Symmetry: D2
Subunit: 474 residues, 4 copies
Amino acid sequence: RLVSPAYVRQGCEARRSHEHLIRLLLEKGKCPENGWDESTLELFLHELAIMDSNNFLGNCGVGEREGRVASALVARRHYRFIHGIGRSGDISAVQPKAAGSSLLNKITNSLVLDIIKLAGVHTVANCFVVPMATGMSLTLCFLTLRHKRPKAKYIIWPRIDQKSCFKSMITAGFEPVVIENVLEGDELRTDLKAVEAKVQELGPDCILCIHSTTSCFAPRVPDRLEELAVICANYDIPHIVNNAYGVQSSKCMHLIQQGARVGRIDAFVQSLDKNFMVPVGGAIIAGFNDSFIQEISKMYPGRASASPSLDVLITLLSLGSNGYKKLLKERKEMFSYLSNQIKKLSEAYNERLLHTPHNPISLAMTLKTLDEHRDKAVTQLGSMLFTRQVSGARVVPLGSMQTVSGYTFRGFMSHTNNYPCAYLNAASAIGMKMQDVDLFIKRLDRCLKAVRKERSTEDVDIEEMALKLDNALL
Amino acid sequence: RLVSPAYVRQGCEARRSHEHLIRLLLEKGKCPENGWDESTLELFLHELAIMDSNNFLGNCGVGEREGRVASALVARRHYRFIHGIGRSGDISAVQPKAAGSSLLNKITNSLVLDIIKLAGVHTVANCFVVPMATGMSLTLCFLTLRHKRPKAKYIIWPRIDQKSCFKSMITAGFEPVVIENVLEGDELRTDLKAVEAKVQELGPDCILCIHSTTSCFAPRVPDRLEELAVICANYDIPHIVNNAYGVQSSKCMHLIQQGARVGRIDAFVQSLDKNFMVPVGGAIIAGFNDSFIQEISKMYPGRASASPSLDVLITLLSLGSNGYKKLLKERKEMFSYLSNQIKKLSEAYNERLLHTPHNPISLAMTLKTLDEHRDKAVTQLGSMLFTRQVSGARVVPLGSMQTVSGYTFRGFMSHTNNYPCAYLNAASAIGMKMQDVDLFIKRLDRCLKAVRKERSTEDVDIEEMALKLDNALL
Amino acid sequence: VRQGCEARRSHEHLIRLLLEKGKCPENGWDESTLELFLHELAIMDSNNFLGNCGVGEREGRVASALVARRHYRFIHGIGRSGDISAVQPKAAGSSLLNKITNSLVLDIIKLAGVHTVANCFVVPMATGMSLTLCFLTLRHKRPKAKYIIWPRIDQKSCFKSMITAGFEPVVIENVLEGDELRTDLKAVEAKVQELGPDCILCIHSTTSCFAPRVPDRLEELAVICANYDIPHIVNNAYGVQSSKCMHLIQQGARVGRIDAFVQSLDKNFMVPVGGAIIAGFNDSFIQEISKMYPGRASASPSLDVLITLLSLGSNGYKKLLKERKEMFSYLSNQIKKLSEAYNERLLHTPHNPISLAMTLKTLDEHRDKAVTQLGSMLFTRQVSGARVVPLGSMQTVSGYTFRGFMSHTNNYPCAYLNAASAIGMKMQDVDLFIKRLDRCLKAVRKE
Amino acid sequence: VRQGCEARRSHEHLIRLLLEKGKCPENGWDESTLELFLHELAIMDSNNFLGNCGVGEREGRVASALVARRHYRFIHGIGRSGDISAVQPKAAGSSLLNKITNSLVLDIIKLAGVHTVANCFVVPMATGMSLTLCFLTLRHKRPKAKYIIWPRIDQKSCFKSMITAGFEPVVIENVLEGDELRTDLKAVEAKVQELGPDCILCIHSTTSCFAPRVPDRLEELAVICANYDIPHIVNNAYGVQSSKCMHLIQQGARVGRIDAFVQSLDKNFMVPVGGAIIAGFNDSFIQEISKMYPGRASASPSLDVLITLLSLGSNGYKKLLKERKEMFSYLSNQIKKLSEAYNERLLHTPHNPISLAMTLKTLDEHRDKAVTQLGSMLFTRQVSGARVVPLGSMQTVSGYTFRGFMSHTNNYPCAYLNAASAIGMKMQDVDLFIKRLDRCLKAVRKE
RNA sequence: GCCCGGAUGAUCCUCAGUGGUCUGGGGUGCAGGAACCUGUAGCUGUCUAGCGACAGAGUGGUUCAAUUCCACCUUUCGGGCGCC
Ligand SMILES: *Cc1c(COP(=O)(O)O)cnc(C)c1O
Ligand SMILES: *Cc1c(COP(=O)(O)O)cnc(C)c1O
Ligand SMILES: *Cc1c(COP(=O)(O)O)cnc(C)c1O
Ligand SMILES: *Cc1c(COP(=O)(O)O)cnc(C)c1O
């Protein structure tokens, strides 16, 4: 029954090794260098969860929001964190009914701030995780700016053909002013002259902010943030940066750091899933003025989900800063490999890799040898890649017209009205493996052969199943 | 190695019993009457998850959002659903990269619509789950209305002292017009005269909407929705109903149904955690015009978390419509029991249960025998209940001034400037057990004794630990 | 913050109370307390140490994360290679888990009706192999013994356990007393005198059994064993759930000799098949059985019952025992009603508190094969546990031929159907069984 | 929609290929395929049927949801009460699980070096009790046998397995050949002739062992057994991970007689302690051992290794075997370097492919108790698996007194330290061990 | 249990018929002018101090038009399958 050496022999001795990793986390708020063992991580989460009042043993609840859970499957999959984050008046305020969830939220934001520094923006002052994706999080930035600039109606926006970040300004109730890009070689870049010309035409007081973008599909490249930040500093206009998946790119993060160094960056927003390999649904709002970032936080009404914060807390504690650095290194290596592989394949089909050296993530291969008008070969290629279980291979044909929330885009998906050619997108994002590139190259090869010929074990099953899906669509 | 009767002997025979429960769900989109076994539920989720492209065996990904997951703990706790819900242009659109998640989202919304009908609003036309809490979801309603009424500046709002729903109109960029309530007996009720007078004073075209509330703390009661809906129909003003935790109240839901029957209700919003016992973070936007509800959905920019939808899908499939009906029945029974218990206890301390028959969820017990000015006894009671692990027991002292987003409230937390007395809140919400009431009554008894005396095993450990927490705060 | 750190104290009190007294909690633990306890135990094992390095052949390495998590990172099993009950220095948490589990199990055995039990231990083998371990222990104490005297019960595991241990079973036929089959005490004592006590390894009796057989006459057998100095081993496979079976074991130990009694973990505690409990009244003999086990053993059955008893509590287990009795009365009455409608009757077996039997005399197996059919149809309608017993079934088990197999005698008067009220049975179980049995008898009567 | 339904076909192909050939997949399954497979198997068991009602005593009821989920709802165990290998009609999914697991295990045994193996089965007992089951089976074939001839190895489980089965071990001392302790073939054959083949139950040899002992001379023993018609039982506890041990078993069966060889599941497949594999070359004899097991048994060890082999694949297991060899060379060289710095040496034991030994001659146990200290300090520094062997240690196991215990002989020349490269060992393990051993020897030398 | 095929649900009480905003026959009670003639009829939820009010007719679909036609569900009948 007993065999009891007081509490336990090693019950606190080797347990001390776990507590000291936890104590170092709470004291300095930094990512562990090497990842925690699963046992340490789950011991930490279990001890946090029992701090929440809904998990108290002697608790009784007479309110309308007591964190009750009907399904045990639901309660266990969330590690018994039910109360979310924040209070009804402040999403950043400690919740007296959920001290464990509040500590979870504070530690997660501290870990994320640490990662943003090592990723490239060392002068970041403040950040917080918000359980909305990047589009809605950009909207929250604009909603906050409205009260600071009540006469403003326009958001000046260098064009990028992505529906979420475009709609974010309309959802916030402002009028986007689409600044077309300038073609420099193969690259589409910021028209700094047109941006400043529009500021003078409309008047700075009528401008809510300038909305720039770093991460993007080639042949677009990250915006000229340093020059845009200087324009924003000179005319006293807020600068909001869409950095959706730029955390994984030291080049993108350094553009942000330099923009804040020489000019004005009020906030930059990044997706959680794209930069940390977690489910879709969360984002980080970061900036350099602590007071302003807290203003955006206080703009949020009501409590919020703790699930995205828990996901990234688990991820960073398991990976460590070394594990994340390793993922960033391999992403750079896989970009070179993917670039070289596309160079080799495009040569064999009389295509080429578009020359986009300023885009460190996305690549583009021309599709000039395909006739979309007659054979619809460009659209056929995208469908054949899809049925062959290639995902993320974005096909951009010429002359696509698209209306988004009443605004009509010419040459939609190409970020400009008349790009020289149609092309295919591919990218080296965090977590990509060599198998992804090799299978993509192999399957793109077969698709290019089949479309050019049509104008004139499990591998064959994926091919046989693709032929059935191809014929069903036809 | 084999012993193989083709595939299996019963491998499809008793499996058929599982498939037929699943086929009935997908065909009619209704809640099962009796809850599913856990085995059926998890088989369903596993088969949905393998439909998502990130879980394909022969998949390769070359994009920036491929649903990659670094941590196995994260992937398993979400049943391998990574891609979220929706597309970057439409949160309601099927995601070709996540056919399983898209089916999950559609079935969840169908189940939730079914529950809203059986809960009382049988004429509901459309609804969707949004992974934001009720405050942010109300903001999304106002953001959608802005484009339909671009000259509107004001939201007419019968006062309720809750920071989230108040801030939701300011976060959306509108000016709330606070309509004070009328005291009728002990109850605070809608001042229909002042609402119509403010409509005429400001002009209907300047009114974005009327923002009413059903579920609320006593002594406030649900707004007079039928009369407000008639005012809204006559002046052509949209009507938005805050039904945060009203789904659990057949009285609240019937007010909504009658309001739509005789007048105009454009949308009503309810919390997921408060009505379905799931983690905080999600809500339902429902209405009677299908086209308008889709407009709110399309206002959302970008993809969204699937975690709240998964939580309520698991919950409703496990509970069934019978299980949910049982929770609603027990909530009514526990309201009577809690009411009778407070009647008995308040008598022994020369207090009374406030007469609020029109509030079917929240109750209030007077605290007239406590002196807040001299002894601060009302604040002391709330703290003593907290240290004794009573949660949800809301103490409302007199004369509290509070500023929320620049607007100053007199008598804050009482929903009126000068309520006759201080009081204590308690409620019978879904999932409450008799132990909650008995422990609340027992601990409130000890607290009342201690505060009145101060002016003149685990039970004792909760008391001994409360005395230590009480002295530390002092 | 200060309330949350004081909230861990609430869990610590429950854990401390368990380590100090080793009794089941009265009310079951919350899952949060249980999993907290298990995680703290598992990190005491050396394979889960953060700075551990392993240069041996048994380091507790786990290749699959799915395997490690589902066992709460308990990898080293129980015991040492020289003693299954010894503390494993490389697995202090697993050793603590094994000691607590044995304590909780002893607590339940007393609660269930054998208050005078002295010792017991969980063994990760089922009841058959656990009876074998008992016989293997008795061999070294009685090296001239060759026979095991065994009142007949038609169950292959307990019968084979004697042959596996290397002894010759001596089958004692039962006596028909009314409808019941009971111990033939005269035939037992006659075989003791014929073969000689020194040649008898033990008397192997059985409590829990299928009707119309009833628990053996343990008191009279315990006196025979005491008079002749012959060990007594009781097969109590699923008798823990029956206060009548347990009190019968308690009485036999009071008036006579009972060396050990064995019970299945899955049949009495609703856990997966695989474990058993060896219990006795001589602490030293039970220890001798434990020390006869060679090498380490799986900790999975111990962990299953530990989780179950901590989640149920003694009140939760008491409730299941009370409901088993009420379900038995309900099942009995419903069989009386149904048997009346088909010109059958419920066999009068008041000495069996778990299993019942209903006559199948009106069904013709000789001409229509109707009795064999009924059990087949009962399966396809998904009635599990219903057991049809035809007449004159011959069956060979390890070379021994049984006549009238499944009936525990050579010529029982009639064929019959078995049904039982075991722990965890619901009113749905009986109502479904009655409905499907009615439909099954209608179709057989038509043809 | 059409691509997702075709996506289940990809998983179905892997599952279909497993059921059709019963071999390990070359590359490991994804967790999604594995858990899909397990869930489909579990719903085949009757306890998981949606319309099931239970009126029996063994219905597979589970009180705790934590217990049910952690076992993937496999509750009924393996086998029937009359045959552990028979298909359980109430648990078709569990029976299918057991058959697949035995097939995968047979595939690995061939892959590991015994290509001529005919049959094998997983038994949810550890290696000690599994050797006991072998001896218990041999008793009925050789009812006059009393002795088991056993080349000495100082391990309590395999030694006790002979006594548990009820036989007298005949300890054959080993021969010092250089630094190695090897089989004394002349003494073995002399005991066969002295005691008489008819009185010998079997010869019980051992492959995997601690240095400086080496695997037994299986070929010469297999010929002795064939000439005298004596069964041969091989203790291969952790020899599956060694192509040298497995090939030695293969060669012995080719030139002589080997009736069965037994191996631990945890030591060879990195799963929790609790299971073993009994394998042989006569399909009928292995079946006889299986049928000697009485009653049902736990399915937990089978499920653990099934998950592990499906997740690893044969390529994954091959990789672990290759890395064990490379880790052995690395550990050997690092011990050579460290022993040189302390005026010690690595004992030359080239016939042992798993375990190594380093001399501790410069440490004084008689005056300073330094040898006993080193093992103590090695533990507190969290070095597990390191094994110090002093001189002249006396130890009694089940009544038999060993002199020079832990050393496998009565007077080995010196004390020494044991270290091994077992499957799953990392370069961190060796580097940490060398560093901590260096610090441990520095402190002992100071005092 | 599953598969197949009839009917079944709350005005394939009752037996029938009917795509036409339902009809025929037998039967019961309540109400008046043995049985005859006439009228009449039940249930569930919600909101009410109550009168009463608001809905629902297994869930959906087709159609100008569903008691009627189609699919599925509930109940029930019949057939098939049966070493567990
Ligand atoms: C719960 C509730 C809300 C919503 O608050 P959130 O934290 O945003 O979910 C709004 N108003 C009232 C009256 C509420 O009870
Ligand atoms: C991912 C991304 C966004 C954000 O889209 P959400 O679905 O809201 O997360 C915005 N702009 C770009 C360029 C992106 O890549
Ligand atoms: C591991 C091993 C055994 C196995 O003993 P158990 O604890 O019963 O598994 C037996 N002999 C030797 C030499 C071993 O290494
Ligand atoms: C259950 C039971 C056994 C146990 O046999 P195992 O399958 O080994 O657990 C033995 N005898 C009887 C009468 C039983 O009911």
